[PDB]
Coordinates of C-alpha atoms and ligand atoms in Angstrom, one line a residue:
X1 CA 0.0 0.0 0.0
X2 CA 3.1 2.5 -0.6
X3 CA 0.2 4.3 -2.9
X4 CA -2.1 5.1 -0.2
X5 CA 0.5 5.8 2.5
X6 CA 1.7 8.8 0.3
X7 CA -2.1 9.6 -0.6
X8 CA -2.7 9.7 3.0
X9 CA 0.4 11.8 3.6
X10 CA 0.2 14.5 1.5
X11 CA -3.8 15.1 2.2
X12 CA -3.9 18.8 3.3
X13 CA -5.4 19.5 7.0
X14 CA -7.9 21.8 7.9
X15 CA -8.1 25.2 6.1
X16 CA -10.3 28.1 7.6
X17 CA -11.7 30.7 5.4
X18 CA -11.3 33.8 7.6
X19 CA -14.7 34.5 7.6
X20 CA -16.7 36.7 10.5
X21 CA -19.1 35.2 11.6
X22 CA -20.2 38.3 13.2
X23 CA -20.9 40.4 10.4
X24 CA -24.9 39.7 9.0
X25 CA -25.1 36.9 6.1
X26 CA -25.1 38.7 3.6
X27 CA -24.5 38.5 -0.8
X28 CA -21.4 40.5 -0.8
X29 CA -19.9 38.7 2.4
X30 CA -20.7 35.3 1.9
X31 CA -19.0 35.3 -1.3
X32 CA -15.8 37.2 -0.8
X33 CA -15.1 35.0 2.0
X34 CA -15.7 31.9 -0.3
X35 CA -13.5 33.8 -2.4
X36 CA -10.6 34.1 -0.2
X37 CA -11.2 30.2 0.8
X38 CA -10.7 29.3 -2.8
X39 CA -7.6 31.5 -2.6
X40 CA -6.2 29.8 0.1
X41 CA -7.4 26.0 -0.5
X42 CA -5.0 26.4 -3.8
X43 CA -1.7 27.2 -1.8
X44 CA -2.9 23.7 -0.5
X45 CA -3.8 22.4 -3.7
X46 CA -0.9 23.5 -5.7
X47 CA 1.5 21.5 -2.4
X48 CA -0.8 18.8 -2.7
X49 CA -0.6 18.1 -6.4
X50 CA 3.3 18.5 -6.8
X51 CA 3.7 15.8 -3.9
X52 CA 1.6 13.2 -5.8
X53 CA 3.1 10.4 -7.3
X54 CA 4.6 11.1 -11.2
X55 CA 3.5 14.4 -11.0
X56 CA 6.7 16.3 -11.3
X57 CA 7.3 14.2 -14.5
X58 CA 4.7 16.0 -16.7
X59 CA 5.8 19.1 -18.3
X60 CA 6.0 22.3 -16.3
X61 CA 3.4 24.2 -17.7
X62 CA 1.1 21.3 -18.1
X63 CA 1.7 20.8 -14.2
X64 CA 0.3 24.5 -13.8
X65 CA -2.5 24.0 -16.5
X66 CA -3.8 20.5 -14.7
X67 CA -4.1 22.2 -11.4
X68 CA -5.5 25.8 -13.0
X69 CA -8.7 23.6 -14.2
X70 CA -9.4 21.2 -12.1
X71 CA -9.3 22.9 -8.9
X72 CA -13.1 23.8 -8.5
X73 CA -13.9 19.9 -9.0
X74 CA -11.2 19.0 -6.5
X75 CA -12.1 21.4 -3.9
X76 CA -16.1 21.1 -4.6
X77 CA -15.4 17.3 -3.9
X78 CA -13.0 17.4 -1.1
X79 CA -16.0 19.7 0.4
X80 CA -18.7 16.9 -0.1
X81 CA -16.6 14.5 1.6
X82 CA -15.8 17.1 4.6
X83 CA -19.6 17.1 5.0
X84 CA -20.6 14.1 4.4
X85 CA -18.0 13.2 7.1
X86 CA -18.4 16.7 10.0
X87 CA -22.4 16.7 9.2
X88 CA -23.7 14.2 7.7
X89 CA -24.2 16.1 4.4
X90 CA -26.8 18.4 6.1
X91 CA -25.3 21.4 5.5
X92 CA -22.2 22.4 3.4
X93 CA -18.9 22.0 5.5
X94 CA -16.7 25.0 2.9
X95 CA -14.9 25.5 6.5
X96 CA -15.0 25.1 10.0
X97 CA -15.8 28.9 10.1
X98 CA -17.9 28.8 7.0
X99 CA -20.9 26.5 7.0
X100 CA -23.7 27.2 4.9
X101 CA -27.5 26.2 6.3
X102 CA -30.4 26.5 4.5
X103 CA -30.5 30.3 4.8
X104 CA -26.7 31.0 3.6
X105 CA -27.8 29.0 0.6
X106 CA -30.3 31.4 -0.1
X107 CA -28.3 34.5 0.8
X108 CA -25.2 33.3 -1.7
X109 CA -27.4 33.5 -4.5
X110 CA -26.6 29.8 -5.2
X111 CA -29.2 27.7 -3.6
X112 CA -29.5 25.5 -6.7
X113 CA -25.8 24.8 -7.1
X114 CA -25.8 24.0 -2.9
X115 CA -28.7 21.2 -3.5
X116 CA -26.7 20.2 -6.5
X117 CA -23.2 20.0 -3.5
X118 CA -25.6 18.8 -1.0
X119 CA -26.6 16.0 -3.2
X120 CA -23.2 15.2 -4.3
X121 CA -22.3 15.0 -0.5
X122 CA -24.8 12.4 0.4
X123 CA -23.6 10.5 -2.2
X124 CA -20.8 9.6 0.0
X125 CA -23.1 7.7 2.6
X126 CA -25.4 6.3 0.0
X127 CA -22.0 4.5 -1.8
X128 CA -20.3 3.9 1.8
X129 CA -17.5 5.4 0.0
X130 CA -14.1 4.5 2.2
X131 CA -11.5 7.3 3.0
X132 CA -8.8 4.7 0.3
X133 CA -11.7 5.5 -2.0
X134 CA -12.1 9.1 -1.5
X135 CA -8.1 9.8 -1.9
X136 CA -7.6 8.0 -4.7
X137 CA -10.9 9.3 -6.7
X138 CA -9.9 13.0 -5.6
X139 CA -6.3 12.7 -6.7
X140 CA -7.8 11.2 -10.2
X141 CA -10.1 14.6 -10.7
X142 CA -6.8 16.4 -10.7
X143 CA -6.5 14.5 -14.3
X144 CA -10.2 15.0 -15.6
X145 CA -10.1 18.0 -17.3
X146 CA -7.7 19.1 -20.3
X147 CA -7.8 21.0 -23.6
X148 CA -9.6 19.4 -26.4
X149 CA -6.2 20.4 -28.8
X150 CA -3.8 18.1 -25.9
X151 CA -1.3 19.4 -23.3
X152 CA 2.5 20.2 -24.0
X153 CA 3.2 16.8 -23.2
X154 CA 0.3 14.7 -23.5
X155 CA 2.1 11.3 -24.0
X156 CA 3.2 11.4 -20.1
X157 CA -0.6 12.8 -19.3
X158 CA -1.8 9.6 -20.4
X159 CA -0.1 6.9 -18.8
X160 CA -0.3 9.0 -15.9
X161 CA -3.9 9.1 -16.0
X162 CA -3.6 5.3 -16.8
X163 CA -1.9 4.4 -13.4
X164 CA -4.2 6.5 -11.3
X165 CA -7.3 4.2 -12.6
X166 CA -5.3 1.3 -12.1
X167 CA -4.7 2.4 -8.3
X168 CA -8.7 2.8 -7.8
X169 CA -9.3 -0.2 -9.4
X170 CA -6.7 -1.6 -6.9
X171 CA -8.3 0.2 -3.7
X172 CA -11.8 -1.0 -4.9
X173 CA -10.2 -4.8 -5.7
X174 CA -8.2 -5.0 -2.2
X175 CA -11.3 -6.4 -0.8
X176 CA -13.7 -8.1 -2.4
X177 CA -14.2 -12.5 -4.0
X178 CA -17.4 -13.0 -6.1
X179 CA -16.7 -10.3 -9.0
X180 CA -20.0 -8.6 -10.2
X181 CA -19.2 -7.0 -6.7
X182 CA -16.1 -5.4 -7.8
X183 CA -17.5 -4.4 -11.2
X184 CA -20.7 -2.6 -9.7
X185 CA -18.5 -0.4 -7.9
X186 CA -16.2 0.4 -10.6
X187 CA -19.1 1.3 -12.3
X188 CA -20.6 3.2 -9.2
X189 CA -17.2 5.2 -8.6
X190 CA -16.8 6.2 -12.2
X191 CA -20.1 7.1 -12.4
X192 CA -20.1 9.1 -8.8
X193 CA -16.6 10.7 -10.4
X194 CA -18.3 11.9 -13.6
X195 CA -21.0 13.5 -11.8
X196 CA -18.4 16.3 -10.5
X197 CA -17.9 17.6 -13.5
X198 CA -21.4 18.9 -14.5
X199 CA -21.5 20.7 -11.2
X200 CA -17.8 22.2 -11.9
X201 CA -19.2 23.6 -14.5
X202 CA -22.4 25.8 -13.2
X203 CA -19.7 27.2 -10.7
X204 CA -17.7 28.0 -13.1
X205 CA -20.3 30.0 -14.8
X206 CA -21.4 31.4 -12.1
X207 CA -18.1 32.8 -10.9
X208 CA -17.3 33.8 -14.0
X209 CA -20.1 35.9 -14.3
X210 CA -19.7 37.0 -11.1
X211 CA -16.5 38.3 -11.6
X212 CA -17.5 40.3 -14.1
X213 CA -20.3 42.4 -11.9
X214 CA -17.8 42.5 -8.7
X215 CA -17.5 46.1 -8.9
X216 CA -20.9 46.6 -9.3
X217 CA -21.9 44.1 -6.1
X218 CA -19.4 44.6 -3.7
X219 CA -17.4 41.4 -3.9
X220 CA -13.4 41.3 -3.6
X221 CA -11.7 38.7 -5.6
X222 CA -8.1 38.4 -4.3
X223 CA -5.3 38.2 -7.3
X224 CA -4.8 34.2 -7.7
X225 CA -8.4 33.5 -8.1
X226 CA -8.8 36.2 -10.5
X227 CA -6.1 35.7 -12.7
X228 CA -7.6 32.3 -12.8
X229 CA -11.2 33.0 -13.2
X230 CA -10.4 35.4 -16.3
X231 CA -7.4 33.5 -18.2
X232 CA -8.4 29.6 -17.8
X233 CA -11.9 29.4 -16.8
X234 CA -13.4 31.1 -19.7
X235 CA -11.2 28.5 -21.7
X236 CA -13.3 26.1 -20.0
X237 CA -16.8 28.0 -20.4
X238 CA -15.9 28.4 -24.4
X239 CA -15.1 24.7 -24.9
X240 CA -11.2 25.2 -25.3
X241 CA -10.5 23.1 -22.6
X242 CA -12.9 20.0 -21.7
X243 CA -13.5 17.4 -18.7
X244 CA -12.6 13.8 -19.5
X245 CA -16.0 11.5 -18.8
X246 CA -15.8 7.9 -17.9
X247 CA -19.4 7.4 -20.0
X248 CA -21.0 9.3 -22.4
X249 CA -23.4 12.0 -21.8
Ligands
YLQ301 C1 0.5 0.4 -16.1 C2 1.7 0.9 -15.4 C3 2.6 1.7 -16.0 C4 3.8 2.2 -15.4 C5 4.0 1.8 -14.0 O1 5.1 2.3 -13.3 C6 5.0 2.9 -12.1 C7 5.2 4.4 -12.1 N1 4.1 5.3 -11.7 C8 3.9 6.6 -12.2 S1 4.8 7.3 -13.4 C9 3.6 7.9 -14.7 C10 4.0 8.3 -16.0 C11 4.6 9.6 -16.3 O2 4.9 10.4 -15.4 O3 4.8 9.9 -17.6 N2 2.8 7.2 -11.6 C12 2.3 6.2 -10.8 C13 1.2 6.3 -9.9 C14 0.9 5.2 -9.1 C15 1.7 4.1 -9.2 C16 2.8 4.0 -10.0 C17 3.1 5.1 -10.8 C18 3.0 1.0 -13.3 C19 1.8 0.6 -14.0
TES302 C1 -15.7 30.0 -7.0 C2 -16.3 30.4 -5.7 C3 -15.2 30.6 -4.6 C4 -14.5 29.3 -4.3 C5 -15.5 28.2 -3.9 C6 -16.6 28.0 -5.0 C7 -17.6 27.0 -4.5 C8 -16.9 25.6 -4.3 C9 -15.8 25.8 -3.3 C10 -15.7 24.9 -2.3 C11 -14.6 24.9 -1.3 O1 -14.5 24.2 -0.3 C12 -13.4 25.9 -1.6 C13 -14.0 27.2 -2.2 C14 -14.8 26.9 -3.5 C15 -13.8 26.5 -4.6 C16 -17.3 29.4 -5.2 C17 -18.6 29.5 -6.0 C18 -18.6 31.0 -6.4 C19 -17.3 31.6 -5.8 O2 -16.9 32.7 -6.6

């Protein structure tokens, strides 16, 4: 299990969003504080991602391309898990200083995306998913999303991608005899890891438009995430760049 013992190394603690509570819940600071989270949940991500096995063999600028458009599936998942596992999937676990109930769902201007989170969190209990299962699925959304026209160095991209759904396979497969058992759940987990993507994609919609009426709403967008929202993301809302799906939609 050499795999998992680095997985379960390199998995990045608790991050806090910074957000005061004692201020009223409102639009403007509900959002810039998700804001900064994103912000500071990349730090984490970027340390993550160069720790994972094989990474540092793809191409530099492919390493900085992987992480700039898959971070809001990684992060949106990683959320789901943190609560399904703090809250039972009742409410939305961003933080431990920034949980959304039913009325911060409302107030974000985002309740349909947060059903759509919610949903994805409870997904966890219903599938039993194990923490093995949850590493190894998040580190595979880090290689789910690419341009349509390949990456500098797409050859190593591949077989990269290859062994991370051979070391699934082997979490799910470390376990089990009679094998429609172990089939199901490959099925289940790619099917479970495909539904991220849809969701990825209203957020990154919605923050893109966001970003454009900040000014005019009062919310702050530190540098990182707006560099990002307005150099890669629209490469993902124009079809430049495009998730990679287990099954066909
Ligand atoms: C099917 C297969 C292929 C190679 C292999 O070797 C182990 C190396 N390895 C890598 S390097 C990925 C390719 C690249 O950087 O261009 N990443 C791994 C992740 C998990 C386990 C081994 C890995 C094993 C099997
Ligand atoms: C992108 C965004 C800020 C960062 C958020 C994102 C929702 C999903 C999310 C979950 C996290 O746990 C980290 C912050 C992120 C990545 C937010 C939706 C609109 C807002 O602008």
């Amino acid at each position: 299990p050499i795999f998992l013992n680095v997985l379960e190394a390199i998995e990045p603690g608790v991050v806090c969003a910074g957000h005061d509570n004692n201020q009223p819940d409102s639009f403007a600071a509900l959002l810039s504080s998700l804001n900064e989270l994103g912000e500071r949940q990349l730090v984490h991500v970027v340390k993550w991602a160069k720790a994972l096995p094989g990474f540092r063999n793809l191409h530099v600028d492919d390493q900085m391309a992987v992480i700039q458009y898959s971070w809001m599936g990684l992060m949106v998942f990683a959320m789901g898990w943190r609560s399904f596992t703090n809250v039972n999937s009742r409410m939305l676990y961003f933080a431990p200083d920034l949980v959304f109930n039913e009325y911060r769902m409302h107030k974000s201007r985002m309740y349909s995306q947060c059903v759509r989170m919610r949903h994805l969190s409870q997904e966890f209990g219903w599938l039993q998913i194990t923490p093995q299962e949850f590493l190894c699925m998040k580190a595979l959304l880090l290689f789910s999303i690419i341009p349509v026209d390949g990456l500098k160095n797409q050859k190593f991209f591949d077989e990269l991608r290859m062994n991370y759904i051979k070391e699934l396979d082997r979490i799910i497969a470390c376990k089990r005899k009679n094998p429609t058992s172990c089939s199901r759940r490959f099925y289940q987990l790619t099917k479970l890891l495909d539904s991220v993507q849809p969701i990825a994609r209203e957020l990154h919609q919605f923050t893109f438009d966001l970003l454009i009426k900040s000014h005019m709403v009062s919310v702050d967008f530190p540098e990182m995430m707006a560099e990002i929202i307005s150099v890669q993301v629209p490469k993902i809302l124009s079809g430049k760049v495009k998730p990679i799906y287990f099954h066909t939609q």
